[PDB]
Write a protein that binds this ligand. Sequence first.
Ligand SMILES: *[C@@H]1O[C@H](CO)[C@@H](O[C@@H]2O[C@H](CO)[C@@H](O[C@@H]3O[C@H](CO[C@H]4O[C@H](CO)[C@@H](O)[C@H](O[C@H]5O[C@H](CO)[C@@H](O)[C@H](O)[C@@H]5O[C@H]5O[C@H](CO)[C@@H](O)[C@H](O)[C@@H]5O)[C@@H]4O)[C@@H](O)[C@H](O[C@H]4O[C@H](CO)[C@@H](O)[C@H](O)[C@@H]4O[C@H]4O[C@H](CO)[C@@H](O)[C@H](O)[C@@H]4O)[C@@H]3O)[C@H](O)[C@H]2NC(C)=O)[C@H](O)[C@H]1NC(C)=O
Ligand SMILES: COc1cc(C(=O)N2C[C@@H]3[C@H](C2)[C@H]2CN(C(=O)c4ccc5[nH]nnc5c4)C[C@@H]32)cc2ccccc12
Ligand SMILES: COc1cc(C(=O)N2C[C@@H]3[C@H](C2)[C@H]2CN(C(=O)c4ccc5[nH]nnc5c4)C[C@@H]32)cc2ccccc12
Ligand SMILES: [Ca+2]
Ligand SMILES: [Ca+2]
Ligand SMILES: [Ca+2]
Ligand SMILES: [Cl-]
Ligand code: NA
Ligand code: NA
Ligand SMILES: [Zn+2]
Length: 806
Amino acid sequence: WTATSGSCKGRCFELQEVGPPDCRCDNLCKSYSSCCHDFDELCLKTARGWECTKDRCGEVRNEENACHCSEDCLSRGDCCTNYQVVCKGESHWVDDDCEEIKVPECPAGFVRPPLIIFSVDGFRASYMKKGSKVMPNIEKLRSCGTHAPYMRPVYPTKTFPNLYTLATGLYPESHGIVGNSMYDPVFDASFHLRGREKFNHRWWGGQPLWITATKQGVRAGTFFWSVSIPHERRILTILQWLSLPDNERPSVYAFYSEQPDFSGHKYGPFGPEMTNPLREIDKTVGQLMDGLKQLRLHRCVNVIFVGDHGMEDVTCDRTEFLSNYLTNVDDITLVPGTLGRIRAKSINNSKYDPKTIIAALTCKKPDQHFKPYMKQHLPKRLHYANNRRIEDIHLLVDRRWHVARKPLDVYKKCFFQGDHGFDNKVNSMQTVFVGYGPTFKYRTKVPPFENIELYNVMCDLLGLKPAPNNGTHGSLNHLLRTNTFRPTMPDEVSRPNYPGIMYLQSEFDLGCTCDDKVENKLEELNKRLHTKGSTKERHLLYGRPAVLYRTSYDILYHTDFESGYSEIFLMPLWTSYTISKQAEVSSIPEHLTNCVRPDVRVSPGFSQNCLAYKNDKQMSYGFLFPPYLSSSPEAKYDAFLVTNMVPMYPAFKRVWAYFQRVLVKKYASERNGVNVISGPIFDYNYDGLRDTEDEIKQYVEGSSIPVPTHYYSIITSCLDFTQPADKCDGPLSVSSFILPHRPDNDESCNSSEDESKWVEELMKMHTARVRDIEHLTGLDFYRKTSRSYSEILTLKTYLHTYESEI
Ligand SMILES: *[C@@H]1O[C@H](CO)[C@@H](O[C@@H]2O[C@H](CO)[C@@H](O[C@@H]3O[C@H](CO[C@H]4O[C@H](CO)[C@@H](O)[C@H](O[C@H]5O[C@H](CO)[C@@H](O)[C@H](O)[C@@H]5O[C@H]5O[C@H](CO)[C@@H](O)[C@H](O)[C@@H]5O)[C@@H]4O)[C@@H](O)[C@H](O[C@H]4O[C@H](CO)[C@@H](O)[C@H](O)[C@@H]4O[C@H]4O[C@H](CO)[C@@H](O)[C@H](O)[C@@H]4O)[C@@H]3O)[C@H](O)[C@H]2NC(C)=O)[C@H](O)[C@H]1NC(C)=O
Ligand SMILES: COc1cc(C(=O)N2C[C@@H]3[C@H](C2)[C@H]2CN(C(=O)c4ccc5[nH]nnc5c4)C[C@@H]32)cc2ccccc12
Ligand SMILES: COc1cc(C(=O)N2C[C@@H]3[C@H](C2)[C@H]2CN(C(=O)c4ccc5[nH]nnc5c4)C[C@@H]32)cc2ccccc12
Ligand SMILES: [Ca+2]
Ligand SMILES: [Ca+2]
Ligand SMILES: [Ca+2]
Ligand SMILES: [Cl-]
Ligand code: NA
Ligand code: NA
Ligand SMILES: [Zn+2]
């Protein structure tokens, strides 16, 4: 109940929310049907429109007007934004040359440059180039400020998950807004676009920027605007708030535009109808910047122009129906559209079975436009599993397509020509970032970056300590003129042992064999040097990774590779090696096909054993440093050490072998040498974080050898490819992956074909940031480079997407 009989007189767009049944006058009161009776009359004035005209110049104040053109308007803070232009012979902000803003030029009594976040829904990255003719204000922010070619959204590329990730710096699995639609089984409650449940605070996890600011004594304008409040009124409200007394005035503000998303859904991302919405957004930006200029704030405020996601061409005729695959289609509930999430319609149905649903959806039609996954098998770069609101069964839908349960849902629920939600690496889903103001750099282009990073930067802009989040703080320091955040590298927690030769061959009873009893002070001295680390500078180029948790491990040196060998997990945490452009690929000699050799530096008790692999009819093994890339026949023996062995399903070995035999040499040829670091990952609870020993769900049969859920590789070279990877003077280039360690290749529909037809496509789908591997392994890479730490943080957040040009 709201007793709407109170009044909004002197309360219009009040910042504190008043408690029911007292009536509200804040920017969301309409959405609660809670506004006071006179809210429209007093707070949503429209008389005479939004622009001063020559005849209004110097008018007597009429309080009924939407905005004012009287002499007193500037000190009242309610002039129409074009007041000084029409009445005082000023220029529009857009017509002024840009001039570097070296320091904040703020009115007296501003404690810090305000931040204004101008968020645009569905603003695809290519609109910045493609719409530039019709967006001159935005084009001036972009060219004069700091801008990225694009900004990567989070998955799913839907409205609420992305706006809330912008506000919190968290992945959707962590903030809890995992879709535009959700069911939470613990709450037994549904979050829907239409309706009231979404207003309940319990859905919204983490700590969004307005709460971070308020907790730290920084006042915030309310971010949310009832849809019916026109944009001009939203802008005038923000400008009025900026004229509040110092003690009352917020330092952070947000504007939100439903465009261009609204029209993009109707007309497609590039429909002829899209020009007008783009023009109208630009005009709103112009009103804001003219308004700031009138208030002498246009060289004081930091402005961020940011989108939540892009927009793709999607039409009703491009819909896959689960009723074409499933017999039991009425026993499931689907969250449909540009992603699918499936659960049981009824928890009382004992015959529901996810395994049979997955199989019925796997590679059933030649051109099938979605792929099913249990959520723990989705690409780790999506970070889309660790939340009870994410259904166990997920469908990744091809760009341009929809999935639905039955045809009746599509023609009884064609209109739309655009949609979004797809994989956040898809070019059409990318969005925009521009930063303009005293704290941003001048005329600076920065590489693309992910929207999870921005919360930290907004905290930096406001002098706030960010709440714990998924950004890597410092990775965006290069956007900023000042207020950079200068972190220290994390401290290594475990120091390694450096074992020498400590065990005799006969102490090992591992069930391993190797034809290696085949035989010189010239070259016996040489093998000893290699085992003590004499080639380490060639193979460990960026220092050894630091172990950031408590464990027992050994550094093992070899001619061709160095490794950090875990006594707890019985295999390397990492193996590092460099392959030059000139390196040669050889085969595993016949006599060595089944060779596994005890490592006399590592106890039998801390070794794997061959007998366990023999007994495990499902599990085989592979090697982290590949014997194919051995530098010489003698060095090849090192590659068959039991300490270089890792458990691998035969299906996975197909992938791994092709990577090691073919692709590493291919990258070294293309990149002028590469340094590779490979290793296992254990994430049985799909939380994106390294498992402890007691979380491992699978072991090689009859042993304590844990089975990895994934295998990673980090492939680094010189950004200037005229220099070889091992003699690089400047910036680095990296690509990485986190391949799922699966007992079948059901994910790859063409896997019956030669690996040259499917493996590389699999690897691209499972592309990763170094930072993703760090989370998953508790390792910290690039400890010893000649590069600044911020530059290295940026390198660690880099994702190689394999998408053509934006
Ligand atoms: C991305 O960044 C984020 C933020 O840094 C990272 O997420 C953090 O990860 C931490 C480690 O997993 C985790 O720390 C835990 O906190 C528990 C207390 O949590 C509450 O309080 C905080 C602080 O205010 C709050 O943020 C939390 O909010 C979560 O939960 C509510 C729902 O209840 C949501 O509204 C909100 O969205 C958020 O949900 C997300 O995280 C939870 C996990 O907390 C997931 O379950 C959800 O799916 C969703 O992802 C909470 O309100 C604390 O209880 C934990 O401690 C237990 O476990 C450790 C492990 O040994 C141990 O030390 C403790 O003893 C304790 O164990 C006991 O309880 C166990 C569980 O019941 C039990 O099994 C044992 O037997 C023991 O009895 C833990 O320290 C932190 O909460 C989240 N924070 C957020 C915001 O998500 C994230 O990892 C980053 N991602 C990547 C890939 O790097
Ligand atoms: C400016 O910051 C914010 C503004 C806001 C905020 O005011 N809103 C108003 C609108 C939009 C953002 C939400 C989504 N929606 C829709 O009808 C909608 C829109 C586009 C769609 N495309 N496809 N399906 C769609 C469904 C209703 C809400 C909400 C926020 C929520 C969290 C964090 C920040 C927010
Ligand atoms: C977004 O994050 C939070 C939001 C809140 C919080 O005040 N909430 C949660 C809901 C609503 C009020 C905001 C607005 N929005 C809407 O859907 C919306 C926006 C404009 C509209 N016009 N017409 N209909 C509309 C619907 C989504 C957000 C409280 C929180 C409390 C703690 C942590 C986070 C919170
Ligand atoms: Ca949207
Ligand atoms: Ca076996
Ligand atoms: Ca884990
Ligand atoms: Cl959704
Ligand atoms: Na032997
Ligand atoms: Na297959
Ligand atoms: Zn949309």
